[PDB]
Design an enzyme around this catalytic site. Structure first.
Site, PDB file in Angstrom:
ATOM      1  N   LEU B  33       0.831  -1.198   0.000  1.00 14.95           N
ATOM      2  CA  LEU B  33       0.000   0.000   0.000  1.00 14.95           C
ATOM      3  C   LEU B  33       0.869   1.253   0.000  1.00 14.95           C
ATOM      4  CD1 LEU B  33      -2.797  -0.832   2.659  1.00 14.95           C
ATOM      5  CD2 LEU B  33      -2.885  -1.192   0.202  1.00 14.95           C
ATOM      6  N   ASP B  34       0.459   2.250  -0.780  1.00 21.55           N
ATOM      7  CA  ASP B  34       1.209   3.493  -0.880  1.00 21.55           C
ATOM      8  C   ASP B  34       1.077   4.309   0.407  1.00 21.55           C
ATOM      9  OD1 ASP B  34       0.913   2.278  -3.310  1.00 21.55           O
ATOM     10  OD2 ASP B  34       0.533   4.118  -4.442  1.00 21.55           O
ATOM     11  N   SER B  35       1.894   5.363   0.507  1.00 28.13           N
ATOM     12  CA  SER B  35       1.764   6.300   1.619  1.00 28.13           C
ATOM     13  C   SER B  35       0.368   6.915   1.644  1.00 28.13           C
ATOM     14  CB  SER B  35       2.836   7.394   1.520  1.00 28.13           C
ATOM     15  OG  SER B  35       3.022   7.854   0.182  1.00 28.13           O
TER      16      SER B  35
END
Ligand SMILES: CCCCCCCCCCCCCCCCCC(=O)OC[C@H](COP(=O)([O-])OCC(O)COP(=O)([O-])OC[C@@H](COC(=O)CCCCCCCCCCCCCCCCC)OC(=O)CCCCCCCCCCCCCCCCC)OC(=O)CCCCCCCCCCCCCCCCC
Ligand SMILES: CCCCC/C=C/C/C=C/C/C=C\C/C=C\CCCC(=O)O[C@H](COC(=O)CCCCCCCCCCCCCCCCC)COP(=O)(O)O[C@@H]1[C@H](O)[C@H](O)[C@@H](O)[C@H](O)[C@H]1O
Ligand SMILES: CCCCCCCCCCCCCCCCCC(=O)OC[C@H](COP(=O)(O)OCCN)OC(=O)CCCCCCCCCCCCCCCCC
Ligand SMILES: CCCCCCCCCCCCCCCCCC(=O)OC[C@H](COP(=O)(O)OCCN)OC(=O)CCCCCCCCCCCCCCCCC
Ligand SMILES: CCCCCCCCCCCCCCCCCC(=O)OC[C@H](COP(=O)(O)OCCN)OC(=O)CCCCCCCCCCCCCCCCC
Ligand SMILES: CCCCCCCCCCCCCCCCCC(=O)OC[C@H](COP(=O)(O)OCCN)OC(=O)CCCCCCCCCCCCCCCCC
Ligand SMILES: CCCCCCCCCCCCCCCCCC(=O)OC[C@H](COP(=O)(O)OCCN)OC(=O)CCCCCCCCCCCCCCCCC
Ligand SMILES: NC(=O)C1=CN([C@@H]2O[C@H](COP(=O)(O)OP(=O)(O)OC[C@H]3O[C@@H](n4cnc5c(N)ncnc54)[C@H](OP(=O)(O)O)[C@@H]3O)[C@@H](O)[C@H]2O)C=CC1
Ligand SMILES: CCCCCCCCCCCC(=O)OC[C@H](COP(=O)(O)OCC[N+](C)(C)C)OC(=O)CCCCCCCCCCC
Ligand SMILES: CCCCCCCCCCCC(=O)OC[C@H](COP(=O)(O)OCC[N+](C)(C)C)OC(=O)CCCCCCCCCCC
Ligand code: SF4
Lengths: 123, 71, 340, 184, 128, 177, 89, 350
Positions: B33-35
């Protein structure tokens, strides 16, 4: 004296990209949290997930900007926009500028290839 | 109780293994998952339980286990 | 039955048309005080202006806002107008010449008067706006505050008379109008009547508030007509209270000598002439008081809410309590307690 | 005339029952306050019918003009939560409501009788099948009405009660100030 | 059926007739934008009830005791001759007692809304 | 089903050329006259007093011209108003506000555009922040020219609107239907 | 005495089985007092006796003061909590 | 930059041999070169159609009866784009003046009740006949005539019967016309639909609320009409414009209630009683539920098996359930953590 208004942040140009990254993710959190308040203020047809999707797309657009000064300006303007939206300073008309796709189909003919663009003098 | 958190974090895109949500799974390491995606899932959690979470504590969250430990 | 119906129709027509022409009189009088003309074009000499306003409003669409208790917003102005007009049933234009000859007429006046705050109170609740609620709250506070002053003056007058029959109170002033021994009470009663009708300079709610034009901001059509009519009707009715309490009602001068010269026996001619003289006296007093309402509107700026609450509770009410003390003391000193 | 005008008292009674039910069942508590105002107008009607129009006017002046106004003022300024009448919340009361209705109404009619037997006690309640004969005499030469007589006894025979009431009104001033104002 | 009762019935009838005429003759075309509350042309957010000052409560609450005080003098003015000197003394005592309460209200500044923000009057001092 | 044919006329005169003849015609003409007389005599505008044009509007109410001699009263609330007078430059920031005020007016309603700015943009027509004529936002019944129009020019425009009112078919129009 | 008795009983039942809001409790108190006064005034008329009417007048004055104090208590209670629950007491 | 989303190309030839060159990018100051007459433009559907046409700068001629009712249309175009003519169906010259300069004529004139001057036949057959005759005499390039769903000649309903009669007379007079049959249309301030359900005192059905139709958004009907207007391959075709999913009236009332948070009142009455009531109420001067609408209440929508649809216009109708909240918003009726949070705030001040 002349005091600041709701959700006002004094302008500070971050000296480092990491110290800006923290502020930026905090602004993204603020936008995501205000999405339901936005849907109530601006009487929108669409859903809360649509608003949050739009917010993600906005933040995505500047995902690869490198120069620190440009990121600082993008952050300060994004915070201005957050303050404008959360305080109900915007009316519905300007808020809905952000959602062009949410309006219905404008017509049967949106050209994609060369010939269709050429038949409408848009080649 | 934790099953509610698993339900919240299961219904998200970019993850092709819904069964990969183990009680100590890190979003950036396992889920990829991205930031931004991490902020989204944190907001979804705090909305599902109706609780507001402060800035420092929210940023320090990085995994399912910390989410329950705070829940 | 027939006579009753004719008398009621005559009285009602006279009152409703007097109210209609008071608005024209206010416009003209303000205009000439401001070196202009006022309505001189709708009808001859602008004499149909009020009827044009009434027909226009009767053909105007009623809007019910979304967050609004529509029933309460349509009935609140209706009840204020109904109580305002019911007040006229006890006003006499000559001895016993009234629709309601009540031994409890003063009490009727006070009770129907105290029903006058509910329009302001209910109008704000009609919508779901906090601006509206605050404005209605202030206007209600001003109204009850000056209700106290008016009631006190009523009681001070009854100390001289010991009767709640309005004709009797008028009849005792054939010796002297009560404004002569109690002139400061004339000033105070006029000031309080202006405040109680929320007229300038006591018009906080309409002219310095969150909503642009008071708690009638949301009213269109016939509800607006009801509020406007009730306001002007209350102006004339509270002036009639002033007239019978302090100005001697329908009394002008002793016309016994003139009548004995003119007539040699009772006839419908002498009865009509006496009725005309009495009614004209009361009418001319009402005219002077209406003119004074308009004149005070012309001359002064507005109070604030704090200023007017202070004026009522810190300046006027203590004086009225002191008067409560001094009037029975004077009656006791000189052995002049009124009999029943 | 006669048919309507004979049962004016009964109509006021029926309207009072209906108005009380509407007070309790109102969705909005402001509407409940308005139905309370309606009940007070009905009470004034009854008092006029039995010969006490002065108390009609006093009730209109004090309970509507003052007490109901304060009620509305308070509900306007304050944030009140209310739930609606519903079976889920209120059908559980119906047995106790019915038993209490019967017992309290019957006992409130029986407390007036002087008969030893309980059934006769209740029966006397519904025992006015007769008209009162109104007669004239000429012994009262003064114009003394109810208000005048009240003033006469309150200021002379019972002056002490008036002064104690003055203390009670003093309390009605000092107390509200004591708990609604924050000194210094 | 005297003039009093007929007049009292007639007034509400005329009010209702004017209302009915307006309903019958005016157009009626509600729509969403027209149905908005008018607040200077803009829209405001729904808010928790405003915090109010205590003087607002106090005027309305204190109206009732003072109103009752005033209205309790009606039996006196309707019986003044009958009770003459004894009742005159009694009513004076009653009035004085109520005036003590008026004194309390005046000295406590109970109906004054104090402007919370006041100009700063502190001296400027420098530690040399 | 049943009706299978028509007897409709072919030269029925149009509303601008039709004249009363049938005493039902005369009744409806009298009723329309009363309604239009009230509309003209009780002429209540809401002021959108944007800019310098508003000064001239103020002078219409001043003693020399004394608008209220004609029955004109300016109202703060659109709920109590029949006429909107757009008097000043309409900016883009202001356009939704003007539309909102116009929509809250109860019917019937009319709009007067006063001055070059409101008429078509005037001196600021080529500005990035200016609506080029208020008839992009609201329907307009009368246009008053001038920068500013004089008080007399504005009164002339009000007279033109009253002429339009006086010639409106209301019950006669329903009778045509 | 029927109207007063019915008003009192129904107001008492409304007070007791109130599970809706606190204003209903205030109203039921006021209307129970009204019912008592009605019963008293009818008896005063039937005896031609001023004592009943005197007591009724006193009841009216005391109901006014009780209303003032009860609403002061409610406002003081509101001051700390900012809301009244449907169990607000 | 704006675009001409309605136009396939920039140079266009009408069937009548007029050459139209579109100028500009497609915004308010642009012109398509087309001229259209819209009969019934001030009504519910016509106003949307006129807005869409005037948006791209096609000249719109609007015949009207009452002046005040058409004023809003002027806002939809640039200067000179929307042009108003006085028109009446008993004045043949006015119809001729209305259609004389156009490339497109679309007729939306219909009425859901009868009047003292126009019964169903006068408005749907004779008026359609006269407009079609003006079209044919002036050899107009495109004529779009709008009828209703369930338009059938021998129908029990006088509405449906005169609408079928009008279709036949139109096809007889102008053989290249396009006939359009919309289903019931909902939308902002619709007629005898959602808006009625959201503010009626009581909806009274003589058929239990059992009739079915495929309700269609009015915006979609106008968009389809614009597409039919500009593509000349819809000449002499019939269109059945209907919504995606079929509904019962009771179902629609249920959705309205659920979105409203308010219960809509329904009463079922016998058809004789209700028809008598509607016949009695036809005596007042304002429109009111028709006896023939009660008749139609027993008819369910019947789609022609062989008729062009939204699909042939490359269009996808929106869904009533998704639109209802937006369409009905003005009529909507309107703890444990809140108390604890409330404790920290100030509620009374000096
Ligand atoms: C003067 C007498 C009163 C005049 C009233 C006129 C009138 O009805 O106008 C209706 C009219 C209807 O409004 P609407 O916008 O059309 O809404 C209806 C829906 O949109 C959709 O409308 P709808 O289809 O639901 O229809 C509602 C229907 C009501 O119909 C029904 O519900 C009845 C259904 C039962 C039918 C069968 C009954 C049995 C019949 C026996 C056979 C005969 O009303 C009508 O049909 C029109 C009124 C009937 C007049 C016909 C007269 C013809 C002869 C002349 O009202 C308005 O125009 C609104 C004005 C704003 C009112 C503000 C104040 C309201 C509060 C007042 C409270 C007063 C309290 C006082 C104490
Ligand atoms: C001398 C005159 C007396 C002086 C002053 C009093 C007023 C005089 C003015 C008299 C008439 C002018 C006013 C008439 C007038 O604007 O209604 C026009 C129609 O127009 C006529 O064709 C409808 C026929 C009008 C009936 C006229 C009756 C005149 C006497 C009234 C009593 C506009 O309503 P409208 O079409 O929207 O129709 C209705 C109507 O407004 C509402 O009742 C309905 O409930 C609603 O559904 C709505 O649709
Ligand atoms: C009723 C609501 C409250 C009543 C208000 C009382 C007003 C009043 O004071 O009425 C007095 C008046 C008769 O009183 P009085 O002055 O003695 O008449 C003698 C004239 N020579 O009374 C009258 O003149 C006429 C009667 C007015 C009240 C009648 C209302 C009927 C009540 C029954 C309602 C039925 C349900
Ligand atoms: C602001 C409005 C103030 C206007 C007040 C005008 C007062 C003038 C009328 C006073 C009327 C009155 O109460 O007494 C008048 C009376 C008339 O006498 P007469 O007609 O002959 O009948 C004899 C039977 N007593 O007996 C008298 O004539 C007594 C003398 C008149 C009263 C004193 C007048 C001098 C002071 C006037 C000041 C008025 C306020 C300023
Ligand atoms: C019958 C009981 C009383 C007996 C006689 C009356 C005594 C005198 C009354 C004095 C008038 C002032 C007080 C009136 C009581 C107020 C009535 C009321 O409560 O109205 C508000 C209420 C709004 O509630 P709402 O939300 O609309 O309910 C919807 C449910 N689906 O609306 C409702 O609850 C129902 C609609 C009420 C409509 C009231 C119409 C009459 C208005 C008063 C007229 C006064 C006489 C004039 C010769
Ligand atoms: C004296 C004159 C009395 C005239 C009163 C007649 C009222 C007729 C108006 C009407 O038909 O009802 C209007 C009322 C408006 O309320 P509503 O449409 O439901 O919601 C709008 C919120 N924007 O709609 C309603 O909800 C009806 C409320 C009152 C119920 C009366 C039913 C009237 C039926 C007409 C036949
Ligand atoms: C003061 C003057 C008052 C009298 C005004 C004169 C009105 C003249 C009307 C001429 C009668 C012609 C006629 O037949 O009108 C019938 C009309 C219904 O006609 P229509 O347009 O077809 O309505 C269909 C909608 N349901 O229905 C109506 O006309 C209803 C009008 C009734 C007006 C009664 C006023 C008395
Ligand atoms: N809404 C729906 O659900 C359906 C509608 N339709 C049809 O669509 C078309 C328009 O729909 P809609 O907008 O809802 O209806 P509207 O009533 O809103 O508009 C109809 C138009 O036709 C005019 N009209 C009616 N009678 C006449 C007449 N004698 N002379 C001149 N003009 C007249 C009207 O003009 P004026 O304003 O002057 O009266 C009005 O502009 C109609 O043909 C209708 O039958 C069919 C299927 C579904
Ligand atoms: C008391 C009543 C006195 C006023 C009546 C005289 C006004 C007048 O009759 O004026 C003439 C009116 C029309 O007035 P106008 O159109 O404004 O012309 C005025 C010319 N100006 C514009 C130059 C000033 O003619 C009428 O229809 C009179 C019928 C009205 C009957 C209603 C009377 C209400 C009582
Ligand atoms: C009891 C009576 C009062 C209460 C009734 C309600 C008020 C009615 C007012 C009617 C007066 C009026 O309408 O004046 C008459 C009007 C005048 O129209 P105008 O001069 O062309 O307008 C000009 C506008 N300018 C000046 C701007 C150009 O119409 C008529 O001449 C037609 C005759 C109407 C007769 C109605 C008699 C009513 C009795
Ligand atoms: S038109 Fe001229 S006078 Fe009027 S607002 Fe614009 S610049 Fe000012």
């Amino acid at each position: 004296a002349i005091i600041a208004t709701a959700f006002a942040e004094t302008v500070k140009f971050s000296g480092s990209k990491q110290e800006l990254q923290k502020r930026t993710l905090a602004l993204y959190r603020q936008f995501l949290r205000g999405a339901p308040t936005f849907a109530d203020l601006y009487e929108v047809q669409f859903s809360i997930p649509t608003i949050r999707t739009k917010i993600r797309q906005e933040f995505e657009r500047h995902r690869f900007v490198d120069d620190l000064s440009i990121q600082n300006v993008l952050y300060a303007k994004g915070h201005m926009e957050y303050q404008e939206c959360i305080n109900f300073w915007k009316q519905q008309a300007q808020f809905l500028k952000y959602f062009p796709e949410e309006d219905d189909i404008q017509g049967r003919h949106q050209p994609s290839n060369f010939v269709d663009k050429f038949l409408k003098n848009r080649a | 109780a934790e099953k509610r958190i698993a339900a919240v974090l299961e219904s998200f895109d970019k993850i092709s293994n819904p069964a990969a949500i183990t009680p100590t799974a890190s979003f950036a390491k396992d889920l990829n998952l991205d930031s931004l995606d991490t902020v989204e899932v944190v907001v979804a959690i705090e909305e599902e339980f109706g609780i507001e979470i402060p800035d420092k504590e929210a940023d320090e969250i990085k995994s399912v286990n910390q989410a329950v430990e705070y829940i | 039955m027939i006579i009753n119906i004719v008398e009621i129709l005559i009285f009602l027509v006279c009152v409703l048309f007097s109210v209609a022409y008071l608005t024209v009189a206010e416009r003209k009088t303000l205009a000439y005080m401001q070196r202009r003309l006022g309505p001189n074009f709708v009808g001859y000499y602008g004499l149909l202006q009020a009827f044009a306003d009434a027909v226009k409003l009767l053909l105007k669409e009623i809007v019910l806002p979304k967050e609004s208790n529509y029933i309460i917003l349509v009935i609140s102005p209706l009840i204020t107008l109904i109580t305002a007009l019911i007040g006229w049933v006890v006003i006499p234009l000559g001895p016993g010449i009234t629709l309601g000859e009540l031994n409890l007429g003063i009490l009727f006046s006070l009770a129907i008067g105290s029903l006058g705050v509910f329009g302001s109170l209910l109008s704000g609740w009609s919508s779901n706006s906090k601006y509206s609620l605050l404005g209605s709250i202030r206007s209600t506070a001003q109204l009850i505050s000056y209700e106290l002053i008016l009631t006190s003056i009523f009681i001070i007058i009854i100390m001289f008379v010991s009767s709640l029959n309005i004709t009797t109170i008028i009849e005792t002033q054939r010796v002297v109008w009560y404004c002569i021994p109690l002139l400061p009470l004339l000033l105070i009663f006029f000031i309080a009547s202006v405040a109680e009708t929320a007229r300038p300079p006591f018009d906080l709610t309409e002219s310095e508030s969150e909503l642009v034009a008071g708690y009638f901001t949301e009213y269109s059509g016939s509800p607006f007509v009801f509020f406007f009519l009730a306001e002007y009707s209350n102006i004339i009715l509270i002036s009639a209270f002033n007239g019978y309490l302090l100005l001697g009602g329908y009394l002008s001068f002793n016309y016994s000598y003139l009548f004995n010269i003119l007539f040699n026996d009772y006839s419908y001619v002498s009865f009509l002439f006496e009725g005309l003289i009495n009614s004209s006296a009361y009418a001319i007093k009402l005219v002077f008081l209406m003119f004074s309402f308009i004149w005070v509107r012309a001359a002064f700026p507005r109070f604030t809410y704090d200023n007017l609450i202070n004026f009522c509770w810190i300046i006027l009410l203590p004086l009225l309590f002191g008067i409560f003390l001094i009037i029975p003391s004077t009656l006791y000193i000189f052995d002049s307690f009124p009999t029943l | 005339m006669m048919y309507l005008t004979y049962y004016f008292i009964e109509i006021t009674i029926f309207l009072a029952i209906l108005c009380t039910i509407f007070i309790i069942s109102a969705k909005n508590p402001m509407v409940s306050i308005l139905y309370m105002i309606a009940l007070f107008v009905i009470a004034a009607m009854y008092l006029y019918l039995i010969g006490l129009g002065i108390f009609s006017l006093l009730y209109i002046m004090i309970y509507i003009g003052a007490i109901a106004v304060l009620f509305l003022f308070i509900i306007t300024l304050l944030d009140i939560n209310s739930t609606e009448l519903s079976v889920k919340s209120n059908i559980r009361d119906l047995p106790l409501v019915l038993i209490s209705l019967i017992v309290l109404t019957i006992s409130g009619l029986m407390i007036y009788s002087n008969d030893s037997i309980l059934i006769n006690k209740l029966l006397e309640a519904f025992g006015n099948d007769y008209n009162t004969i109104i007669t004239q005499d000429w012994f009262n030469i003064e114009n003394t009405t109810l208000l005048t007589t009240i003033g006469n006894v309150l200021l002379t025979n019972n002056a002490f009660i008036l002064l104690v009431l003055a203390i009670v009104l003093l309390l009605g001033i000092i107390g509200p100030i004591s708990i609604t104002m924050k000194h210094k | 059926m005297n003039t009093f009762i007929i007049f009292i019935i007639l007034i509400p009838i005329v009010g209702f007739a004017l209302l009915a005429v307006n309903i019958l003759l005016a157009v009626y075309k509600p729509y969403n934008e027209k149905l908005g509350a008018f607040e200077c042309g803009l829209t405001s957010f729904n808010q928790t009830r405003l915090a109010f000052n205590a003087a607002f409560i106090l005027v309305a609450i204190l109206f009732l005791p003072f109103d009752l005080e005033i209205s309790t003098l009606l039996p006196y003015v309707m019986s003044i001759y009958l009770v003459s000197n004894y009742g005159f003394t009694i009513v004076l005592l009653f009035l004085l007692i109520l005036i003590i309460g008026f004194v309390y209200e005046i000295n406590t500044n109970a109906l004054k809304i104090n402007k919370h923000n006041k100009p700063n009057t502190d001296s400027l001092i420098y530690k040399l | 089903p049943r009706v299978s044919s028509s007897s409709m006329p072919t030269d029925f005169p149009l509303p601008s050329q039709q004249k009363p003849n049938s005493a039902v015609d005369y009744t409806l003409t009298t009723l329309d006259a009363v309604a239009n007389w009230a509309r003209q005599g009780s002429f209540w505008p809401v002021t959108f007093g944007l800019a310098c044009c508003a000064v001239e509007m103020m002078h219409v109410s001043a003693p020399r011209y004394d608008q209220d001699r004609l029955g004109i009263i300016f109202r703060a609330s659109p709920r109590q108003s029949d006429i909107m007078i757009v008097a000043g430059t309409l900016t883009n920031k202001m356009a939704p506000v003007l539309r909102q005020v116009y929509d809250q007016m109860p019917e019937p309603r009319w709009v007067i555009s006063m001055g070059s700015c409101a008429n078509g943009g005037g001196y600021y027509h080529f500005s990035y922040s200016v609506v080029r004529g208020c008839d992009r936002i609201v329907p307009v019944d009368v246009y008053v020219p001038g920068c500013p129009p004089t008080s007399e020019a504005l009164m002339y425009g009000v007279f033109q609107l009253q002429r339009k009112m006086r010639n409106t078919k209301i019950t006669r129009m329903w009778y045509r239907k | 005495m029927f109207i007063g008795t019915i008003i009192l009983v129904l107001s008492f039942l409304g007070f007791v089985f109130n599970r809706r809001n606190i204003i209903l409790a205030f109203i039921c108190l006021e209307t129970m007092l009204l019912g008592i006064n009605l019963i008293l005034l009818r008896n005063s008329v039937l005896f031609d006796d001023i004592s009943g009417s005197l007591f009724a007048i006193v009841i009216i004055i005391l109901a006014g003061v009780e209303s003032a104090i009860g609403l002061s208590l409610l406002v003081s209670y509101y001051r700390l909590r900012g809301v009244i629950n449907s169990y607000g007491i | 930059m704006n675009s001409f989303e309605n136009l396939a190309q920039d140079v266009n030839i009408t069937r009548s041999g007029k050459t139209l060159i579109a100028k500009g990018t497609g915004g308010r100051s642009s012109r398509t070169g087309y001229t259209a007459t819209v009969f019934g433009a001030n009504g519910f559907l016509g106003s949307y159609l006129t807005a869409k046409l005037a948006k791209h700068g096609t000249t719109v001629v609007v015949p009207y009866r009452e002046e005040m009712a058409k004023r809003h249309l002027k806002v939809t175009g640039d200067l000179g784009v929307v042009n108003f003519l006085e028109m009446d169906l008993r004045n043949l010259e006015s119809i001729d003046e209305a259609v004389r300069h156009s490339d497109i004529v679309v007729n939306l004139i219909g009425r859901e009740y009868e009047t003292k001057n126009f019964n169903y036949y006068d408005v749907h057959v004779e008026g359609a006949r006269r407009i079609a005759e003006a079209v044919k005499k002036h050899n107009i390039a495109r004529y779009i005539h709008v009828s209703a769903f369930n338009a059938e000649i021998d129908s029990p309903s006088e509405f449906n019967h005169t609408k079928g009669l009008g279709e036949q007379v139109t096809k007889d007079i102008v053989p290249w016309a396009t006939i359009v049959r919309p289903a019931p249309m909902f939308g902002r301030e619709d007629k005898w639909f959602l808006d009625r359900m959201a503010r009626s005192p009581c909806l009274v059905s003589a058929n239990k609320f059992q009739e079915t139709s495929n309700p269609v958004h009015v915006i979609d009907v106008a968009a389809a009409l614009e597409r039919i207007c500009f593509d000349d391959s819809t000449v002499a075709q019939t269109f059945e414009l209907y919504g995606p999913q079929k509904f019962t009236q009771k179902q629609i009332i249920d959705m309205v209630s659920e979105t409203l948070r308010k219960e809509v009142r329904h009463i079922e009455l016998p058809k004789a009683l209700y028809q008598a009531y509607t016949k009695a109420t036809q005596a007042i001067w304002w429109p009111t539920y028709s006896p023939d609408q009660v008749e139609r209440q027993f008819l369910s929508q019947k789609i022609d098996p062989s008729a062009k649809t939204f699909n042939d216009l490359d269009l996808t109708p929106m869904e009533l359930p998704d639109l209802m909240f937006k369409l009905i918003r003005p009529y909507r009726v309107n703890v444990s953590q809140l108390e604890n949070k409330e404790k920290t705030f100030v509620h009374i001040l000096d």
